[PDB]
Design an enzyme around this catalytic site. Structure first.
Site, mmCIF file in Angstrom:
data_model
loop_
_atom_site.group_PDB
_atom_site.id
_atom_site.type_symbol
_atom_site.label_atom_id
_atom_site.label_comp_id
_atom_site.label_asym_id
_atom_site.label_seq_id
_atom_site.Cartn_x
_atom_site.Cartn_y
_atom_site.Cartn_z
ATOM 1 N N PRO B 109 -15.676 29.194 -19.745
ATOM 2 C CA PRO B 109 -15.933 29.279 -18.321
ATOM 3 C C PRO B 109 -15.132 30.335 -17.589
ATOM 4 C CG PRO B 109 -14.424 27.509 -18.764
ATOM 5 C CD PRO B 109 -14.986 27.926 -20.108
ATOM 6 N N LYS B 110 -14.209 30.999 -18.283
ATOM 7 C CA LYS B 110 -13.342 31.969 -17.619
ATOM 8 C C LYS B 110 -13.717 33.412 -17.910
ATOM 9 C CE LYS B 110 -8.886 29.912 -16.463
ATOM 10 N NZ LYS B 110 -9.257 28.645 -15.781
ATOM 11 N N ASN B 111 -14.865 33.583 -18.547
ATOM 12 C CA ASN B 111 -15.379 34.915 -18.866
ATOM 13 C C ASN B 111 -16.330 35.324 -17.743
ATOM 14 O OD1 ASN B 111 -17.930 36.345 -19.970
ATOM 15 N ND2 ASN B 111 -16.439 36.927 -21.532
#
Ligand code: FPP
Ligand code: ZN
EC number: 2.5.1.58
Lengths: 400, 316
Positions: B109-111
Site C-alpha cells: 500500500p505504500k507504493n
C-alpha cells in the site's frame, strides 16, 4: 551538557491524557526506545561521546557507489538516485571522488538519459522527473566539464515543456500525475542548467501556492494533509522562481517549527506522526529557506546566528539515534540503514550545524569537532560551491 | 498462470513459450557504478522484459511477464507503462485488472505506481463503485497512508461522492482523535460542501473541536484544526474565544493553549485592538514562558515571535 540528556528533558515526554489511541501508543514506544538510547551512557557509566562514524559511513558509501547487494533490487528503477544520495553523502563528508569514478558515474547517467530529454531510472528506462533531478544533481556534484556536458539541454527543455500543464503543474512523467514534488524537480534542473524560458513556469507558483493548507504546510496536491517532503519541495521551488511570498510564510514557519519532537529532538514528517532521520533535511531544511524569504522582506527580528529550530537537539538525534555502527544512517533506532537515510540524515546534520545569512556565519557542532560537515545548499541539496560552479558554467550557454 | 512465488515457478529462460526470444542483458556500461547484483530470478524476468520492451511485443505472454516484473519491483514505472499499453491493445478485461491492482495494493500500500494505476483503471472504466470501500480497507490497516487518502480525495472530487465522508471522518476520528490525516479529511469535506463561512457550520466545528480538546488536552491535531479554521478570518475576529481558553487552562493546558493565546494576541495587536500595551506585555511573557520552559525545543521560534512582536508594536 547534552540537552537531550538533561534530567528536565524528562518532562518533555508524551503527555498522553490517559486516553490511548494508535497514535499515542506508537509515539510512546519510539519515545521509550529513544530514552533507552539517551540513558545508555549513564546506565553504562561512561561520558557520552557524540561522534559521527565518518570512516564507517565512507566505507558503505565508497562501496555502494560501485556495487549493491540484491537488497537494492527494489531500486532498480532509481539508479540515478543511488548516485545522488551517495555522491551527496560523500561530498557532505568531504570525501573526494577520483576522476575515474567521476567519469564512470558520468557515463552511466549518460546511458540513463533519454534521446528526447530527461533521465530514466536506469539504462533504457523511460524518462521521469525524479531521476532527472537526481541525475542533474549528481552531475553538478562532480561538476567537471565532462559532467555538465552529459546533460542535453535542448532536450531537457523539450521534455520539461511536454510535462507542463495549463494550471501551472507538471507531470512527473508523460502519462503520469502531478504533485508539488515535480514542480520542484523541474524548477531545479531548469534553474541549474539555465533552461528557464519566460513561460515555462507560468502558473507554477500559483499552483504550488494552492497546496498550502490550514495546517500551514503543503500537501502533495491541493487538499492533501501538510507534509514535510512536499513542503520542502513547495517552498524550495518557490525560492527558485522567486515567489516565496505566494505562500502564507507565517503559517508555514509555525508549522515547520511545530514538527520538531520536543523529546526525540528530530522532526516528524506530519503532525501527530513519528520522528524520522530523513525529515532532518526535509523539515529543518525549510528553516534556512523561510529565513531567506523573510529576510528579503526586510524582517528585522530575525536571528543572525541560528536557524529557527533546536539545532542542538536535532544534531543529538542524528548522532545518537541515527547511525548504524556498520556505517550509514537511518530513520530511527531499530530501522535498517539505507543510502536515502544516509543522504538526508547527513544533509540535515549539516544544516543543523551551519548558520549563514549574508556575512553572518555561525556554526554549532555537538560532539567531537570532527563532526563538522561541508555546508549544503537548502534549495538544491548539493554543495553551495557546486551550485555557484554549475550556474556560472551553464549561464555561459544560451538558453535553448 | 504461475505465481512468482509458487513452489513450482520456473525461470523464464527455462520456459517453452519463451524459447524463441533471447533475453536482453542490461547495459550498465563497460564498467559501472551503483551496479546491483540482481538475483538469478530478478535478472531472469528483467532480461526477458528488456526483450519484449525492445521489440514492443504486445503479446499475451508479454502481459503475463509484466506482472512478474511488477512483483519483483512494483516501483519500476517503465514496466507499469508497458503493462498499460498491453492492457489496452490486448483488449484485456479491466475488472480483472481491478482485481489485480486491488490485490497488489493490499500487498504494498505504500507504493505510488500501484495507486496511479488504480486511478488509470477507474477513469478508463468510468467506475468508482468499489473505491471508497476498498480505500476504507487500506485505511483500516494504516489509517494514515498518504496515497490512500490521496486516492479517496481524487475519487470523491471526480465522481462527486461527498455525501458520506463526514460520517466516515467521524467514524475514524472516533477511533483515533489523533489521526491528523482524518482532521485534514474533515476540512476537505466541509470546504468543498458547505464551506466554513456558514456561521452555523463554524460554531459547530469549533464547538466540536473544543470538545475534542477538553477530552484530549495534549492532542496537537485538534489545536491546529481550531487555529486553522479561524486564523484565516483573523483570530481576533472572535472576541470571547480568549476568555474561554483562559477558562480551560486551569487543569487541561499545556504548550498548545499558551501558543494559541499568543497567536490570538499577535492578531489582536495586528488589528488595532485596545489595551495594546497590556496585551503586548501579556504576549511577551508567554513568549518567554514558552521559550524558557513550556516549549523550549522551539525556544528560537518563540524568541523570534516575542522579538517581532516588539518591533511591530512597541510604543516607539
Ligand atoms: C523528489 C523529492 C526530492 C521528494 C521529497 C519529498 C518526499 C515525498 C519525501 C518522502 C519520501 C518517501 C515517503 C519515501 C522515500 O524513501 P525510499 O528512497 O526509501 O524509497 P521509497 O520511496 O520506495 O519508500
Ligand atoms: Zn525517513
Amino acid at each position: 551538557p547534552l540537552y537531550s540528556l538533561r534530567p528536565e528533558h524528562a518532562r518533555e515526554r508524551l503527555q498522553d491524557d490517559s486516553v490511548e489511541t494508535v497514535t499515542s501508543i506508537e509515539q510512546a514506544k519510539v519515545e521509550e526506545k529513544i530514552q533507552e538510547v539517551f540513558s545508555s551512557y549513564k546506565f553504562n557509566h561512561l561520558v557520552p561521546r557524540l561522534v559521527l562514524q565518518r570512516e564507517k559511513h565512507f566505507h558503505y558509501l565508497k562501496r555502494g557507489l560501485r556495487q549493491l547487494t540484491d537488497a537494492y533490487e527494489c531500486l532498480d528503477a532509481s539508479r540515478p538516485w543511488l548516485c545522488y544520495w551517495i555522491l551527496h553523502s560523500l561530498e557532505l563528508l568531504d570525501e573526494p571522488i577520483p576522476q575515474i569514478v567521476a567519469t564512470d558515474v558520468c557515463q552511466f547517467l549518460e546511458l540513463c538519459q533519454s534521446p528526447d530529454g530527461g533521465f530514466g531510472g536506469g539504462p533504457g528506462q523511460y524518462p521521469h522527473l525524479a531521476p532527472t533531478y537526481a541525475a542533474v544533481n549528481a552531475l553538478c556534484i562532480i561538476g567537471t566539464e565532462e559532467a555538465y556536458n552529459v546533460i542535453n539541454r535542448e532536450k531537457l527543455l523539450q521534455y520539461l515543456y511536454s510535462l507542463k500543464q495549463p494550471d501551472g503543474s507538471f507531470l512527473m512523467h508523460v502519462g503520469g500525475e502531478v504533485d508539488v514534488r515535480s514542480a520542484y524537480c523541474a524548477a531545479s534542473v531548469a534553474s541549474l542548467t539555465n533552461i528557464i524560458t519566460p513561460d515555462l513556469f507560468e502558473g507554477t507558483a500559483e499552483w504550488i501556492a494552492r497546496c498550502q493548507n490550514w495546517e500551514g504546510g503543503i500537501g502533495g496536491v491541493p487538499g492533501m494533509e501538510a507534509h514535510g517532503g512536499y513542503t520542502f519541495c513547495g517552498l524550495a521551488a518557490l525560492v527558485i522562481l522567486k515567489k516565496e511570498r505566494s505562500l502564507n510564510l507565517k503559517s508555514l514557519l509555525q508549522w515547520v517549527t511545530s514538527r520538531q519532537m520536543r523529546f526525540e529532538g528530530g522532526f516528524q514528517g506530519r503532525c501527530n506522526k513519528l520522528v524520522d532521520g530523513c525529515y532532518s533535511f526535509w523539515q529543518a531544511g525549510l528553516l534556512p529557506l523561510l529565513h531567506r524569504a523573510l529576510h528579503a522582506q526586510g524582517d528585522p527580528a530575525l536571528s543572525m546566528s541560528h536557524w529557527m529550530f533546536h539545532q542542538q537537539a536535532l544534531q543529538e538525534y542524528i548522532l545518537m539515534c541515527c547511525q548504524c555502527p556498520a556505517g550509514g544512517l537511518l530513520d530511527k533506532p531499530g530501522k535498517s540503514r539505507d543510502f536515502y537515510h544516509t543522504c538526508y540524515c547527513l544533509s540535515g546534520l549539516s544544516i543543523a550545524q551551519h548558520f549563514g545569512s549574508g556575512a553572518m556565519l555561525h556554526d554549532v557542532v555537538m560532539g567531537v569537532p570532527e563532526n563538522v560537515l561541508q555546508p549544503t545548499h537548502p534549495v538544491y541539496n548539493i554543495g553551495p560551491d557546486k551550485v555557484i560552479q554549475a550556474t556560472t558554467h551553464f549561464l555561459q550557454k544560451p538558453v535553448p | 498462470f504461475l505465481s512468482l512465488d509458487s513452489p513450482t515457478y520456473v525461470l523464464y529462460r527455462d520456459r517453452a513459450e519463451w524459447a524463441d526470444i533471447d533475453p536482453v542483458p542490461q547495459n550498465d556500461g563497460p564498467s559501472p557504478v551503483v551496479q546491483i547484483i540482481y538475483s538469478e530470478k530478478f535478472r531472469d524476468v528483467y532480461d526477458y522484459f528488456r526483450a519484449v520492451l525492445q521489440r514492443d511485443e504486445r503479446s499475451e505472454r508479454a502481459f503475463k511477464l509484466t506482472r512478474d516484473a511488477i512483483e519483483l519491483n512494483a516501483a519500476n514505472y517503465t514496466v507499469w507503462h508497458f503493462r498499460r499499453v498491453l492492457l489496452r491493445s490486448l483488449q484485456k478485461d479491466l475488472q480483472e485488472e481491478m482485481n489485480y491492482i486491488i490485490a497488489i495494493i493490499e500487498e504494498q500500500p505504500k507504493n505510488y505506481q500501484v495507486w496511479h494505476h488504480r486511478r488509470v483503471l477507474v477513469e478508463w472504466l468510468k467506475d468508482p463503485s468499489q473505491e471508497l470501500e476498498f480505500i476504507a480497507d487500506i485505511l483500516n490497516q494504516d489509517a494514515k497512508n498518504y496515497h490512500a487518502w490521496q486516492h479517496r480525495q481524487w475519487v470523491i472530487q471526480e465522481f462527486r461522492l461527498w455525501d458520506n465522508e463526514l460520517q466516515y471522518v467521524d467514524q475514524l476520528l472516533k477511533e483515533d482523535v489523533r489521526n491528523n490525516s482524518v482532521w485534514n479529511q474533515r476540512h476537505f469535506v466541509i470546504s468543498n460542501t458547505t464551506g466554513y463561512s456558514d456561521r452555523a457550520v463554524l460554531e459547530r466545528e469549533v464547538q466540536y473541536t473544543l470538545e475534542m480538546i477538553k477530552l484530549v488536552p495534549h492532542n496537537e491535531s485538534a489545536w491546529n484544526y481550531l487555529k486553522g479554521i479561524l486564523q484565516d478570518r483573523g483570530l481576533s475576529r472572535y472576541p470571547n474565544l480568549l476568555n474561554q481558553l483562559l477558562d480551560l487552562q486551569p487543569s487541561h493546558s499545556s504548550p498548545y493553549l499558551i501558543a494559541f493565546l499568543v497567536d490570538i494576541y499577535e492578531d489582536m495587536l495586528e488589528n488595532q485592538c485596545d489595551n495594546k500595551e497590556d496585551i503586548l506585555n501579556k504576549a511577551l511573557e508567554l513568549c518567554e514562558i514558552l521559550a524558557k520552559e513550556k516549549d523550549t525545543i522551539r525556544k528560537e521560534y518563540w524568541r523570534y515571535i516575542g522579538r517581532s512582536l516588539q518591533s511591530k508594536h512597541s510604543r516607539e
